């Protein structure tokens with residue numbers, strides 16, 4: 001449930017790269033306010049968008065969360081990440097959702113696709129579109 005103004009890569013960045021606060025409850029307001037639902041789980045990779053695009057250059061692998069897909073790519077090393085867990089669901093009032101935060105150093109697996117021709121910048125022809133797994 002991506003908001004229509006974002007490409008998949010832009011939505012990927014919004015959910016997994018641009019952690020607007022080191023505190024999950026604050027950071028998740030962005031994601032939840034965009035998708036009009038409190039996400040149960042969300043990982044913020046403490047890495048850069050360009051770093052992930054280079055992970056898209058790594059050898060293709062089966063997506064562990066989406067077995068029929070072969071458009072995934074494994075990071076060559078562990079990266080710091082913050083994982084946000086829903087601790088206070090609030091379906092009838094998104095703004096009151098609260099999260100716990102778990103810091104960790106793990107690998108990630110991203111699905112990558114060619115860029116949205118009209119809205120994604122030419123600079124990156126291949127872009128991350130889904131965070132398939134942290135492992």
Ligand SMILES: Nc1ncnc2c1ncn2[C@@H]1O[C@H](COP(=O)(O)O)[C@@H](O)[C@H]1O
Nearest residue numbers: 008063066067068069071111113129130
């Ligand atoms: N064009 C795309 N190719 C692959 N995955 C995509 C694409 N657009 C969105 N996704 C993400 O891919 C996930 C799983 O795709 P699938 O394996 O086909 O079910 C979804 O949860 C989406 O977030």
